[PDB]
Amino acid sequence: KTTLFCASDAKAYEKEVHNVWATHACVPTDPNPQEMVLANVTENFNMWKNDMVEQMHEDIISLWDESLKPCVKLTGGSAITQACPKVSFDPIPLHYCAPAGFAILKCNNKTFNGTGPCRNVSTVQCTHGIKPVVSTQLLLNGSLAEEEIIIRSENLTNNAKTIIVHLNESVNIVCTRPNNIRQAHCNINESKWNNTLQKVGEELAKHFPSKTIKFEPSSGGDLEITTHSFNCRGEFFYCNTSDLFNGTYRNGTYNHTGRSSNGTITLQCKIKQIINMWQEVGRAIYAPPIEGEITCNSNITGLLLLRDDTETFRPGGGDMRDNWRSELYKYKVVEI
């Protein structure tokens, strides 16, 4: 183990909260980072048991703690209140670096699925730039798989283990609350989504011999996980995906059965004030949404799934440590 530090291009003149936090909590990234390629070496990685994930998790928690102040914060029977000003919120890439005396192993096997042996290895001082994007169901503004779609699980046969799909082509998603002040919506091109679930259906079909692979909405639970929740400019969006995860893959073909219109799937969204915290068990209450057009144009770079004659997969999430995993799976902290 170690104590990693972070590096970023945070502007000290920037009011945006990620910048304000990184400037005081992080170090300036290196303008030209080099890696140290290695042959005749193979190392084992376990994305599911990586301490780097917990360290980033802890930073993002303190980053949010300092950045997003909820009016009220309830933990059972006790409540804390404070000023909760609206802020400039837009994630920036964070780099994680090993201190003097340690390094960071980097798997270069472009098909490596997070766990097991990795032949093509390398050594770096810092990870690549990772946007600490908090969301469920859909992974946003992340990196793409270089060659084909990659299915990641701590155990695939264990239907309780979250599955991380690493897309090799991003699907664009635009969410907007137009200038009901809490009513918003997202647009997704159905063509891109059809192709996405077609491929994803194939990669899954593999792993699961010959079964009718269905995609359905989250069976139930808190809104944070039964919908695609995320933060857009500080506002907490909860977007319905019952028309997104709605289809079936059989006989090597995908059929989207979710509603769509002129080739665009739209998610009905709801900007909420009361939010079940991901940082800890509790509820945070924020002020009503700011005025004007609130829009976030993002890229879907991965999916979070949970499997139930037909296998059924549903959108998952909730443990933000999986969001960090989807980018940190390549890395491993090692000693010198």
Ligand X SMILES: *[C@@H]1O[C@H](CO)[C@@H](O)[C@H](O)[C@H]1NC(C)=O
Ligand Y SMILES: NC(=[NH2+])NC[C@H]1Cc2ccccc2[C@@H]1NC(=O)C(=O)Nc1ccc(Cl)c(F)c1
| 287 touches, from ligand Y, ligand X, none (C-beta below 5 to 8 Å by class) | none
Residue selected from 189, 276, 295, 312 as contacting ligand Y according to rule CB under 6 A: 276
Told to check if 129 binds ligand Y by CB under 6 A, we report: no
| 281 touches, from ligand Y, ligand X, none (C-beta below 5 to 8 Å by class) | ligand Y
Residue type (1 letter), 173:
I
Told to check if 136 binds ligand X by CB under 6 A, we report: no
Query: CB under 8 Å to 128, separation ≥6 — which residues?
Result: 93, 95, 143, 327
Told to check if 191 binds ligand X by CB under 6 A, we report: yes
Cα Dmax for the chain: 62
Told to check if 224 binds ligand Y by CB under 6 A, we report: yes
| Least distance (Å) between residue 42 CB and ligand X | 11
21, 25, 70, 134, 225 from 65: Cα distances, Å: 10, 13, 9, 13, 21
| Least distance (Å) between residue 76 CB and ligand X | 25
CA distance 5 to 147: 31
Query: CB under 8 Å to 133, separation ≥6 — which residues?
Result: 91, 139, 140, 141, 142, 230, 323
In the block, which residue shows the tokens 């946003």?
140
Please give the size of the binding site for ligand Y, defined by CB under 6 A: 18
Told to check if 83 binds ligand Y by CB under 6 A, we report: no
Report the run of H or E that residue 193 belongs to, with start and end: helix 190-207
Query: CB under 8 Å to 218, separation ≥6 — which residues?
Result: 137, 225, 226, 227, 241, 245, 306, 314, 315, 316
Closer CB to ligand X, 43 or 90, in the complex:
90
Query: Which residues from 153-182 bind ligand X, rule CB under 6 A?
Result: 153, 155-158, 168
Told to check if 240 binds ligand X by CB under 6 A, we report: yes
| Least distance (Å) between residue 215 CB and ligand X | 8
CB 158 within 8 A of CB 48: no
Query: Which residues from 103-122 bind ligand X, rule CB under 6 A?
Result: 113, 115-117
Told to check if 136 binds ligand Y by CB under 6 A, we report: yes
Told to check if 319 binds ligand Y by CB under 6 A, we report: yes
Query: Hey, is 154 helix, strand or coil?
Result: coil
Closer CB to ligand X, 125 or 248, in the complex:
248
| Least distance (Å) between residue 31 CB and ligand X | 21
Contact string 289-318 vs ligand Y (x = CB under 6 A): -----------------------------x
Residue selected from 225, 267, 269, 271 as contacting ligand Y according to rule CB under 6 A: 225
CA distance 306 to 221: 13
